[PDB]
Design a protein around this ligand. Sequence first.
Ligand SMILES: Cc1cn([C@H]2C[C@H](O)[C@@H](COP(=O)(O)NP(=O)(O)OP(=O)(O)O)O2)c(=O)[nH]c1=O
Ligand SMILES: [Mg+2]
Ligand SMILES: [Mg+2]
Ligand code: NA
Ligand code: NA
Length: 326
Amino acid sequence: TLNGGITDMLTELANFEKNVSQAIHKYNAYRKAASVIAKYPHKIKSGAEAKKLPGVGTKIAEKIDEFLATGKLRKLEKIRQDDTSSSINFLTRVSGIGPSAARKFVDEGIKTLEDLRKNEDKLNHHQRIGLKYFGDFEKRIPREEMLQMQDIVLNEVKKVDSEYIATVCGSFRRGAESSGDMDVLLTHPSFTSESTKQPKLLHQVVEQLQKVHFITDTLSKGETKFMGVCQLPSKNDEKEYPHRRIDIRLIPKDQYYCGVLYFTGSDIFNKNMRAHALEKGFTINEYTIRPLGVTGVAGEPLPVDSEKDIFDYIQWKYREPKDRSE
DNA sequence: CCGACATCGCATCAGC
DNA sequence: GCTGATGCGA
DNA sequence: GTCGG
Ligand SMILES: Cc1cn([C@H]2C[C@H](O)[C@@H](COP(=O)(O)NP(=O)(O)OP(=O)(O)O)O2)c(=O)[nH]c1=O
Ligand SMILES: [Mg+2]
Ligand SMILES: [Mg+2]
Ligand code: NA
Ligand code: NA
């Protein structure tokens, strides 16, 4: 990355607007801008040069001019010195503590890691686990470990029912040399868009993974989505592996391609592709791609037989997962 | 200019 | 208990 | 914050 300084600045601004200002559209704006700059194959010389890129307007162009000249942004320098901002920005790093909860905690005088550890009774279950593994969850996962994790998940799933198919998606499927967590897409022939012929399909998989002590904690768990914690087994006298975030998503078998497109991401890629879909008169979610009728309201799900079919509908050239890391 | 901006599962809560 | 909104993270 | 209609 030739423009690391700029993209870091924009990411920190994005995080500010999300956590502190609670302005999700400003968060999205900064992150779109950071993304379009990150893939720009020249070392940016000026704000004007950057402004040519879609997503970079006048305000960000001016910030880039300040940053290139001085190596800093006064706006960020001030944000970093603001106590409420600093407090909120820290608290939100705990999984389960969002922008609203963070402000509420600060109001109640709970604003440090130590404050959290003595007020565990004021956290909900998710927050409690996020606190427990606060350190572990900010560690990246080497692809080598992702492979061991994949190996365990796929084989344990096979043991429950050989007709399950588990696909690791997210940054892993995009070929990343490290990941922030593990994302698993799960299908079973019994569960389609037409019916659910067996209950507990996701539950039985989670149970098996708990049984072999791979899954260690549960943040949330419903009929189709599990969000939790896992850990690789270590050997005698070895320091234990860090605990890792794992998500498992059960998607109707006949909707696998929309499902795998969604869970492969990246999140910015999905946002941009779905935005483009809307411009082309379609709407895309993890289940279907549907036309938007004369109404403005989604019609019937269109035939999809590959990821590429989805690209074709919105008139995009196909892009392999490795080229979706926006 | 000017607000529309992708989309959704689960946990939680207010209101009835 | 049901419904719908909100917070949160994906 | 940005940008298309
Ligand atoms: C956060 C997020 C994720 N997703 C989809 C695309 C992501 O690739 C996929 C998994 O979410 P993630 O684990 O938060 N992101 P990742 O797997 O691409 O990257 P990382 O290595 O986990 O950080 O879910 C969205 O569609 N909208 C989102 O806002
Ligand atoms: Mg991931
Ligand atoms: Mg994930
Ligand atoms: Na621009
Ligand atoms: Na958080």
